[PDB]
Amino acid sequence: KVFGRCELAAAMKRHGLDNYRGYSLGNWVCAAKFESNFNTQATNRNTDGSTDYGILQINSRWWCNDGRTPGSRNLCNIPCSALLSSDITASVNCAKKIVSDGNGMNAWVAWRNRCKGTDVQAWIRGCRL
Secondary structure, three states, X not given: OEOOHHHHHHHHXXXXXXXXXXXXHHHHHHHXXXXXXXXXXXXXXXXXXXXXXXXXXXXXXXXXXXXXOOOOOOOOOOEHHHHHOOOOHHHHHHHHHHHOXXXXXXXXXXXXHHOOOXXXXXXXXXXXX
């Protein structure tokens, strides 16, 4: 599913991401924009043999199982395919674990490089939330 911006903002908000670990909703929309362009089906292989999945490009070395990443930990206890669903529940649940792991949203290198320090509230402008 390719979400609209406001459509994703509402979904993330429904699932409890607005202000989760102190990150306002704009941060999460901005991260999803630059990770996946709001596409739940997005996949990207990494140099180390892992792959990133879904709207928030969650990685198969630590968080989900894809059956081809040796020494996968599967900390979210999910197959990586669950992160590609039109239903973002599994991605949100896993994202909440990741952002709690100690480095906040710095875990998403795309957020660090294109969101952090910017006016992230711009990403929820216009939306009925």
